[PDB]
Design a protein around this ligand. Structure first.
Ligand SMILES: *C(CCC(=O)O)CC(C)=O
Ligand SMILES: *C(CCC(=O)O)CC(C)=O
Ligand SMILES: *C(CCC(=O)O)CC(C)=O
Ligand SMILES: *C(CCC(=O)O)CC(C)=O
Ligand SMILES: [Zn+2]
Ligand SMILES: [Zn+2]
Ligand SMILES: [Zn+2]
Lengths: 342, 342, 147, 342
């Protein structure tokens, strides 16, 4: 008869026993480097020039184009549940608005600056963050000033970027986050802020490690800046580019960045890890891109994973990889989930 | 008129310019720490006791229950395309087979050992890896010998595990990978192998960092060992448990592991990063669990990302995080994709 | 009878009490004695009692002798005097010993370490944060600091 | 009967035995990284414009407002007991003295510069240190030149600070310690000193890590610069700001600081620890702020701790955390305590 065999073993080595540290539910919390709090979430917003807008993108519940006139009733509840911050994305829909130099970027009458004045008044405790780029304002759609050759003209673009950034700060935005990727833009924005005597009031949250890939789908649909699928990648770091990513982090920090953002998040967890050592003194933020979040919804839909569970696992993943800040479309949800206790 | 402003900037610092290294397609390859080769893929197999089986699980194309009699025609093409290895998972379906001590685990007539003899003969170049656990053979389903109290009895289970492992090695398997998680099992298996005078022929590929979570869904459906949803987590590391994960890696390596596996993969990229430093001298393998792969398919289905693209991005992610080996259900595909060139 | 502490006897005694608490239902045991090697003996006892996988060993790895345990002594009734008979209590300037005690306890099975006092020993939690970088670190705001 | 149980134990491991190193009183001294000497203490002084002043603040024995005419009889004994240094704090009480630009800061006839000339003559061996700030001279009270907006104007303030610092040096002060916190002030003061051809004679003791908090109470009462309670915190580092503190240390050292000060002390011991690695080549000084010392007195009063004991424990704490210098109001006492021996 085939019988159950058992090998001859020695006494248990203490050094093999780790189970004493994670056998209780509360211990599973004790074991985490950092716990998830509501004041760690940054909710993204897509302001439309149509002050009466409210368009849902790709069926994703936390991705809408809202006009200033709907902003109150939408932000009201959120702030009530504990939302402490948001990152503004302008979507100028009015015809003949976009152009070669993204002039509308700092248009005092655009969705961004108008959104700032609104928030700064209807919600003075909220911390306003503004994404800085020319992609949603240039006729071509790229994140900068290109030559007739097509390529990006560093100097011109960067000089343009510093202008928009400083203008947002002047408008009342507490923080600026350039997602362009053009070399040296962080230094030029820091300088501009310095000369504008705003460097001591504006947090520079640089998109230090933004990789090109197959996960920005939804976002492109909503921000309208349509790069195709994945060919025209400006300063977007190749996915395998760990070396460049590490160098970009040391660069941006050296150029004035007060905090860095890694994105995508989930698919780049080892990168936040590297950042956690390089930028060990700076707040690290993870960006759960529109594609990752749209991916969680899909799988959940097909019942491949529970939505609420995979969100916690994924988000805690950010915290574990080294991040202490999180920009995510799941913010509305977490503002609820984080409460369920007591 | 709102005009496009441009700030006063200084001459470009060389140290800001990184674009010179990733502006060409071939350079994007030059920038990667390691390139993806076909001999890096480990295709998982689920052997059934019904020698004539061939059941597709959850609609996932690369997750099937195959009997020995279908194994040839299935492995034929794969090996032709370059498959160099597979990790065996036994699924005994015959009634009254499973029991309290997972006796059938090393059953010379079971799917695993029978699968080994088959492969070792019909495909002598293939490298055989066998997952070592009691979960798919115990009446209860857990990965070990539990007390009447329910809990796992370390000593008994581990002594049992070393037995099965050594028996697989004796059967002809080149490598054993214990996915249990019970403390000290690696040392007991190494010893058993040593005493069985097989330690110099069997690669011990330990599941050093296996986290409990919401991503093993599909696999449970196919391996039939049904832990519920996510409550009875044996030695499964809490997702936030980076400290424990780091300690488990140092432990397993110290206990004889010749290589380590991190799993899940994508959601634990920072962990392969940590492993890449801790186990800097050992091959690191990433396991693209059934749930992550089922997640890529879902999102692709809803057209959230291109399947072939997100697979390359995700898999290259493993290589970038430090891994040099990959166990994935996408192996059939990659064996094709990796070819398209010349 | 000499007054001094008998390591072997005491430690053997300590492992007994610890394991008994675990057997009673306590999830975690924290030995605040300071006697060398007690962590290993308690870990073993727990192992033999087949409780090592359910009991978190929260060792008082860095407990310094000093002028801050006043209140606590009044309440726990165990009255060492003022500050003379300090058993395995680390001298306040003893950073080296504190660092060694941390590596020892962790190596002996501790699942987490406690530093105490807290405030007056913040640089020590700092050292611990590197030494025991993989273990939960706990600070003890002693009765004297709070008072 | 409940009997005393004793577990079965193995032979003692040498590696568990540390007691051989601290079982004797002299060994407790042998174990310290550095011993406490009298020439390590810096006694603070608050000079008043009333040359005949002598006011005790908040009942704290070593916190008095003294005029030049009382300075001798007060410093006489102290220097006799071994005092080798003091840090000057000016308290101009004369009406209409303070203003918007802290003009009186380097007033050749003010308490500070007058105090320097006095000391330099009546006690030539004493090492004079001068705190550099505008807080005790500006009409508003803040440590710098503010805009009508209220905020601090970096450029103006810093340019002002370098002026005062260099003037103190010109007056005869051996060392300058800017406690402002304004970014870049260290570099501007170093430069000024360089241009004043005094950089090779003046030790720049920067307040690199000065945290805002609830411990400067007493001091505010005596220096008269009354920021409220704890709201208007200029460049004061948030208590949780370890990252910023680490960056500020690397900055000040890079800007010319010859030594750094950490403050508060006790409540920031881990910070001196960080400093001990960052500024491993520079003397590190701890500042036992007025609030910590007032706290020791209180607890001692209520008989919670012995004054003389907790002072030694706390102060040795500074030395252990990495400090080799100590600014404390307990200096008179220690100059006595350090003697009791032989
Ligand atoms: C990044 C986030 C895109 C997404 O959510 O899909 C926007 C940016 C780089 O500014
Ligand atoms: C791990 C892989 C599970 C999956 O593919 O979903 C199996 C194991 C831990 O043995
Ligand atoms: C430590 C705490 C004493 C106090 O709170 O004052 C007690 C112990 C060492 O067990
Ligand atoms: C710091 C010391 C304050 C105190 O003793 O309470 C004075 C300064 C920052 O110049
Ligand atoms: Zn852009
Ligand atoms: Zn198992
Ligand atoms: Zn000041």
């Amino acid at each position: 008869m085939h019988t159950a065999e058992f090998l001859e073993t020695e006494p248990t080595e203490i050094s093999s026993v780790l189970a004493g540290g994670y056998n209780h539910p509360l211990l599973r919390q004790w074991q985490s480097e950092r716990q998830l709090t509501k004041n760690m979430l940054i909710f993204p917003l897509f302001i439309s020039d149509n002050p009466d807008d409210f368009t849902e993108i790709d069926s994703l519940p936390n991705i809408n184009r809202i006009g200033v006139n709907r902003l109150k009733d939408y932000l009201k509840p959120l702030v009530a549940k504990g939302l402490r911050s948001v990152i503004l994305f302008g979507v100028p829909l009015i015809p003949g608005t976009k152009d070669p130099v993204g002039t509308a970027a700092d248009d005092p009458a655009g969705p961004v600056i108008q959104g700032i004045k609104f928030i700064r008044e209807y919600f003075p405790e909220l911390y306003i963050i503004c994404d800085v780029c020319l992609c949603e304002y240039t006729s071509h759609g790229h994140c900068g000033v290109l030559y007739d050759d097509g390529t990006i003209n560093r100097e011109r673009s960067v000089s343009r970027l510093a202008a928009v950034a400083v203008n947002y700060a002047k408008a009342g935005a507490h923080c600026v986050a350039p997602s362009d990727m053009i070399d040296g833009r962080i230094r030029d924005i820091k300088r501009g802020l310095i000369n504008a005597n705003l460097a001591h009031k504006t947090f520079v949250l640089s998109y230090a490690a933004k990789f090109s890939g197959n996960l920005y789908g939804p976002f492109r649909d909503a921000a309208c800046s349509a790069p195709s699928n994945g060919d025209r990648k400006c300063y977007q770091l190749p996915p395998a580019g760990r070396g460049l990513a590490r160098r970009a982090l040391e660069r941006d920090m050296s150029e004035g960045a007060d905090g860095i953002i890694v994105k995508p998040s989930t698919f780049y967890l080892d990168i936040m890890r590297d950042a956690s050592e390089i930028c060990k003194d700076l707040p690290i933020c993870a960006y759960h891109v529109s594609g990752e979040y749209a991916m969680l919804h899909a799988a959940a839909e097909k019942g491949v994973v529970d939505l609420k569970t995979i969100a916690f696992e994924s988000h805690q993943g950010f915290l574990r990889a080294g991040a202490r800040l999180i920009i995510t479309y799941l913010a509305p949800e977490f503002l609820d989930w984080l409460d369920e206790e007591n």
